[PDB]
Design an enzyme around this catalytic site. Sequence first.
Site, mmCIF file in Angstrom:
data_model
loop_
_atom_site.group_PDB
_atom_site.id
_atom_site.type_symbol
_atom_site.label_atom_id
_atom_site.label_comp_id
_atom_site.label_asym_id
_atom_site.label_seq_id
_atom_site.Cartn_x
_atom_site.Cartn_y
_atom_site.Cartn_z
ATOM 1 C CG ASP A 182 -1.941 1.140 1.208
ATOM 2 O OD1 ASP A 182 -2.813 1.179 0.311
ATOM 3 O OD2 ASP A 182 -1.876 1.994 2.119
ATOM 4 C CD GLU B 299 -2.445 2.273 -3.600
ATOM 5 O OE1 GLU B 299 -1.795 2.266 -2.534
ATOM 6 O OE2 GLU B 299 -3.482 2.957 -3.752
ATOM 7 C CG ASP C 295 -9.149 2.441 -2.692
ATOM 8 O OD1 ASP C 295 -9.945 2.908 -1.845
ATOM 9 O OD2 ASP C 295 -8.093 1.847 -2.380
#
Length: 572
Positions: free
Chosen positions: A319, A350, A417
């Site tokens: 992340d 990410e 997301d």
Amino acid sequence: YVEFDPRDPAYLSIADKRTVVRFEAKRDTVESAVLVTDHGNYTMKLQVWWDFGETWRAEMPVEPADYYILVTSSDGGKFAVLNTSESPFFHFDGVEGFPQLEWVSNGITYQIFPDRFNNGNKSNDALALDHDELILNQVNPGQPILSNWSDPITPLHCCHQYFGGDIKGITEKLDYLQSLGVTIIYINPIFLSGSAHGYDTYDYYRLDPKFGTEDELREFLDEAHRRGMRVIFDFVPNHCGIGNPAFLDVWEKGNESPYWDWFFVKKWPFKLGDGSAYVGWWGFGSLPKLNTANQEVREYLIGAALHWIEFGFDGIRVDVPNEVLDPGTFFPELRKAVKEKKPDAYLVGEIWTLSPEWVKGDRFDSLMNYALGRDILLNYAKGLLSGESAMKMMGRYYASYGENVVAMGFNLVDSHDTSRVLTDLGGGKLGDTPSNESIQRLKLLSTLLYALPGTPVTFQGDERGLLGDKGHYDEQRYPIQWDTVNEDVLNHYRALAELRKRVPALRSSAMRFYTAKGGVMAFFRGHHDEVLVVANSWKKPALLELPEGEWKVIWLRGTVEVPAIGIIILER
Ligand SMILES: [Ca+2]
């Protein structure tokens, strides 16, 4: 003008047991090129092109070789691409620095948001409220929500509304996933956290009782392994939650706490959740930022990742890597530690952008390729980008990443997301009925994914024909309703999965561009240009002339009529 650099994977890389040599030139300035090497000569052809630039490629087996490139210009020129003067020939080490993961090239990927996927153990649903963030937060206090599988959406839907989903829920669905050909699974955070998403880790070493015990997870990993599947877990090193004991130690101790160096406390004493009192992620007091530049913090987080790699996981997803302090000393050590314990591990970061500095061979194996699937492929499937503009964007992508990186790319279009791709394609909002036009675009976008190098990533339920707008309290995270199915979309993804297995050219790393007329997007696939992928994004049927030869339809001769909002795959 010619750009070439053997030290960068974009120009020299090893993919599909071959050495891929590529250089950059100006658009429409090269007629031919030949990769001349020590007793060996191979022609070069252009594979991608963009606004102001081109890329010519050639392949050769993995072998120590000295080489140079002989480029024939468009205006009748002849130049030799050499370096220095005391050593004009280049030199390839034959050694493998950035290996291509074969199990990532050939696999299908499925992204699992665990609390919203399948509830296979109702006993642990209540175990979510004790350590929930809204209970511990002294500033902005609240009351989490426990609800049934088919309950309506609430303002807390993104986090602090729990529907049940656990690890035993995905275990019971392994027979469903391999029906879809799924070989890789990307699971969202499952450690001890006070949210529904789980990005506020309290203890990186303890499983959260919301999703299950260690024995339920061990049963999940083992049952997926014997089915020939790998699991990647989500790693959140940049920030933790307010329930993290190391942070609570700083809460009522201040400079007495040995973990004071781990955080960036501005004001002390402070009430939990005050974004002004300590540095958080985007100033949020819910996610205090960890001092990844600290050596104590770094080794602790690396130690947690190795623990769960040792536990059974076959790869890691990181992340927000762009927010981690000292990325030149964190991820190189992270990669070095994980590659020793399991050299077959998958490291995916990410980064929502086209940034090659993260895939140079010292940090990540691939990025979450939003820059490909969402950035350019979703827009094309919407009927809005032309073929010319689409391919020009793809040309930038494929010329900037090494072919070995592209061949193991984490190729996703949506996730936890973003809104669902069926909604992005004009299918409607959650509760509506998807228009059949948007499903024509959903089949177009899916077939584009399953034909390019890398691994296609599918968000949970996208194979079922679901809707969801991110702007309405995160509708993409509504739980899966297993008694409703769009059997047409379900069998569509099943047919794509087996098609990708039947045709080895779709799994390969070599892809070459054809042309682009308006809405038509055509490109080759495979090392001998065996497969041609022709698409059409507009509402009117287009006319296209085929490359030389005779073609067998798998998803003819002369000129063809590629259908409206249609995608066809051909072979010789
Ligand atoms: Ca449960």
